Amino acid sequence: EKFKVITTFTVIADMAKNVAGDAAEVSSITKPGAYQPTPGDIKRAQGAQLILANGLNLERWFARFYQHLSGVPEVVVSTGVKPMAWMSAENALIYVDNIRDALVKYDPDNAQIYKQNAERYKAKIRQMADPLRAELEKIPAD
Amino acid sequence: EKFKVITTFTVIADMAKNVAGDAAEVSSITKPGEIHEYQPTPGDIKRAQGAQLILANGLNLERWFARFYQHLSGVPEVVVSTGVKPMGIHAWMSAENALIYVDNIRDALVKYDPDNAQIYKQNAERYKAKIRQMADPLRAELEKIPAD
């Protein structure tokens, strides 16, 4: 069985699928806005070994007034407890490094795969970011 | 300068203060329950200054997830947005939960402030001992005996 990763954030799943390649299975589940989960979400969550999440630095109230803390590490400390818009290239690169680091940490047996997939993906992301490329896109077809 | 830690949950701050002792400073700030304009107070602005670690609750504590995905309560959860600058984007069970929280808070402080690892480990042990003592099942029935 492949290593299994889930997230509630669709674009994290998109990026993680490119870092994971064939080394891990990445699935997204739906976070209710507001209920009952679909059988597909039951199946997608089954066997998850890692959850990838956005942190406080992406909550609007916090990002508006605590920007200086955007790089502060945030650690989930509830593990085991049982209770009673546009994506800039710069941000995509940071996400990919963080996703790579998490997959390397929790699935060290595939570290080299994750590191090289991330490097390849980052290389494509920068190629897409070239400002000259954006200008040449404005040229209409003959 | 003491290592500085923040959280948005008072109970995490309380537990973290016991684990941190004199080695780290722990402050909490208020998170609104989505609010259009939520302005920080000056007190929260100052409490968050110089924060070096944020302690968070995970998906396993969201009501919808805790109910339907109980089997995932122990699955690790990692924040991967760090550095993103968004330009564009049953008293016995409570005690068992406290013990788990304390271990996780200890582990986080040991990781991010390793110079004080032993202090965090011993403070965590002392605090866990108090939690176990408070929740000892052998004490609970005798506690019911009415006072004079």
Side-chain angles (χ1 to χ4, degrees), chain A residues 6-10 27-31 40-42 44-45, chain B residues 59 64-65 69 72:
Chain A
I6 66 169
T7 184
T8 67
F9 302 93
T10 313
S27 309
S28 60
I29 59 171
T30 299
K31 176 171 238 173
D41 269 9
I42 301 301
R44 272 181 291 277
Chain B
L59 185 57
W64 69 274
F65 191 93
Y69 301 101
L72 300 183

Side-chain angles (χ1 to χ4, degrees), chain B residues 105-125:
Chain B
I105 293 163
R106 174 201 65 193
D107 291 353
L109 291 168
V110 166
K111 173 174 292 182
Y112 286 96
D113 189 31
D115 284 2
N116 292 305
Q118 182 70 11
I119 293 173
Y120 300 132
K121 289 165 188 177
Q122 70 178 132
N123 291 349
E125 252 302 290

